[PDB]
Subunit: 333 residues, 3 copies
Amino acid sequence: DISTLPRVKVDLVKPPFVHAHDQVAKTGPRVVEFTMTIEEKKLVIDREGTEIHAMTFNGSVPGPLMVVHENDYVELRLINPDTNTLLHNIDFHAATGALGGGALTQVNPGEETTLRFKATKPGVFVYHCAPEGMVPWHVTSGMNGAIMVLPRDGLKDEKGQPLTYDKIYYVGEQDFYVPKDEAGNYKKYETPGEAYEDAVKAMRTLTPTHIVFNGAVGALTGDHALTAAVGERVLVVHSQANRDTRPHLEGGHGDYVWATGKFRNPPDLDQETWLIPGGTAGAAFYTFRQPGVYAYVNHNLIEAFELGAAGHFKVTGEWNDDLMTSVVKPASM
Amino acid sequence: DISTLPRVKVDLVKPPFVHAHDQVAKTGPRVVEFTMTIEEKKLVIDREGTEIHAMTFNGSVPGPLMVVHENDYVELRLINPDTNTLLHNIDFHAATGALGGGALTQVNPGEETTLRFKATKPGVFVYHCAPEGMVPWHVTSGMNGAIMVLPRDGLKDEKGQPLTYDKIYYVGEQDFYVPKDEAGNYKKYETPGEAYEDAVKAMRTLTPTHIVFNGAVGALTGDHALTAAVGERVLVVHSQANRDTRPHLEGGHGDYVWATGKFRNPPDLDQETWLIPGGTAGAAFYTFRQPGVYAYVNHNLIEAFELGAAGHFKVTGEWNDDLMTSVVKPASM
Amino acid sequence: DISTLPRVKVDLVKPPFVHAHDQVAKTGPRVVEFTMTIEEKKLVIDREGTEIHAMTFNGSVPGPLMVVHENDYVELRLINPDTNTLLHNIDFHAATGALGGGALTQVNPGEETTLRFKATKPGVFVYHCAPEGMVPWHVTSGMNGAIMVLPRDGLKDEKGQPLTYDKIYYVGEQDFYVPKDEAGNYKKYETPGEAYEDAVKAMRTLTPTHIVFNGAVGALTGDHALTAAVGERVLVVHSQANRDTRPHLEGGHGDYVWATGKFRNPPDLDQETWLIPGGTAGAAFYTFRQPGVYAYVNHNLIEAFELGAAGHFKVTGEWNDDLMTSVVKPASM
Ligand SMILES: [Cu+2]
Ligand SMILES: [Cu+2]
Ligand SMILES: [Cu+2]
Ligand SMILES: [Cu+2]
Ligand SMILES: [Cu+2]
Ligand SMILES: [Cu+2]
């Protein structure tokens, strides 16, 4: 059966960008092959130069977004180079059985494996490392991502009508728990393991030191701000593998939102803010109507502006005065 | 076009009360004019006399609830008297563009401005101050409120049938982060700015010192308890601009609930408790069936009874023994 | 009227098990009688032998799950033996009036009472102790449970079709706040009251020391793991009376989920993870398709694997290679 199915290999791209794909499937079910390389590396996450030892899928935090269609077969080749120091594996929330594949993908440095699973349920799902005994440590070190399983006939609105996006971005939100000394300064380590004992103590406080989008404070700002134009329909996929988040587009809305990310359910309309539970991926669809800068944030504003969970959207186009206008510019009474 | 539209001016009232309005619009679209004055003032929030320097819209925490209809134009005159010390602005989650209006409403003390925006989406929304660089500080100082955009034909249930309320109350929940000394006592300041550095440090703990309804512990109790009668249909609007909350009416339910507050979506039925994400406004509809005192609380009972997120509902009428009855009063075995 | 109704007495069983009942009612409305005895007792909650003074309904944490049908009358005899030291009562989120019955069920040690209420709304609800002045203390000491009010014609899917479960389990999640000394060690007490002052201080931190399923770390693991077989339809009822939780079945899904637990609403489909707000009970329906061990967890993995919110499901049957297969077992590159 499967031997008879067509196979296509796809090359992943770095978040927030997404690899090429078709919204409406043009072919029948296929075996979609992906390759990911685990990479333990140092990452500086803030403007003060705070450095951590991140555990990543393909060298990025979050790991890349995989896109397939309902009933396609996902075949992943997972490689753990001998330059790494820890055992890793992968748990797909999209898969059925063996801890999402975690029990079948345990690879020590210098090992590799290939897992295949049927994408039976449509929606956006979280995937993350989950080694027995140190699950939270690997997950909060940046080892998680997301996979999107699109219905074979694309997305639809609450009334069964087609929803087509012009652009898609993947925002991975990550909570970090950096160990601190007596005065409150962050500690630095030489190797991932040298941080273990301290890492566990920091996690137990349940209080993150940093909460970031795309691996670092201000990563989606400045020259890296997300872009769009008035009239463009954008789909924003957002994931949080360990903690709740409440995305909000300052100046806009979520026209159609799947907060818990499962497409067989009708979307919620006109959302101002939505709750994505820790360990879930959600998606929001919006058509830009005004140009300018938009602040895409986790709406616990302390987490957004003090901890790092904030990004920018830069939109081009003509301003619509009917929707909004300054009748009297700020002036002296 | 707009010059041709009828205009009506409305005077806001102090929460939990709401200004006069029509549920079902009796006129076509209009320009609804509101005026709000920013007020930085000292507020004591608990029984021990803990005092803070609140930043308010119209002198209250929360700011007043504005009510308009879908497709009406909201025109707000925002005044920042020269008696204030900080720059302020306003971000309407209900508006489209320029950070909800935040980028067009920056007023220094002694300045005023007038913004107009089209209320294109129905539902209850949060509005809050958002000055670049000190957003969380202003928001957690009490500078937020809510606006309700009613469908032109009023509220409807899950089956498209009309829902009419007899009473409406606005409960604004506020998380405060009061700086403390070594022993755990709250610090007092002379001016808002003298608290800034300390305020930022307290917020980063992500742990509120107080979580209150209507600006203070016990503000909606005693002589200020919310009132209703058996048979009355009540709509309770609840907002939290920065933190998640889980409202619950002890002794009752949310017959029809819009947890994320957007009316184009069908309400959730028979809710015991619902989650309102930080940065969102929700609404719950309930018909009282029993007289007595009801405890309206944030159902994280520590936040409710230890931190202050609890209010009272006092309902008059006849007790229904079919619904509930004490068969054997507490007595010695 | 009620005098004329048939009456049946039911004997409760210890969680995670549930007492015998019919999904589809075979009789008309009845008076369902239950008896519960309050029990203050010492409980060790972790592997290090940490001991607490729990306040329980029927000697367990959580209290037992009660099952009745819509419009049945629940009659509870609540006994507080003279061996107990505190006053207790019961608040049913399923009931209407008098604080869910809390105002009518205040019993001092050596007292008992009998309350009756009409189960007018279908769904799973939380019930908990709520004595004026020490509500959070009693609730976070383990004094809460849940009651399920099934529609008279059983559960149905999003399309009105019948949903029948073969097995049902009740998972009660409990957040504990154990007082600690200067070094971080847990304090031990002789009597419940001797812990009061310290208990209040620990709760105010809003940071649990333990978050467990069925009263203890690892309570639903090993020989006590939940069991099922491939092909079996299982309903998992989950409750949290004070704090939000985000259940997730590692290796599976929630085919049909009522996150806020009210059956008059259509279920959410194909959920990977769902949010149950503090003070709520939810239910998830799943048909096992693969054998093996599944990790049922609160998906804030720190709370799950460091604090104790994790259990096991052990499923028997034949492995399905179409759904998942290891193409290349972990091997040296
Ligand atoms: Cu790993
Ligand atoms: Cu906002
Ligand atoms: Cu301000
Ligand atoms: Cu309650
Ligand atoms: Cu009690
Ligand atoms: Cu997981």
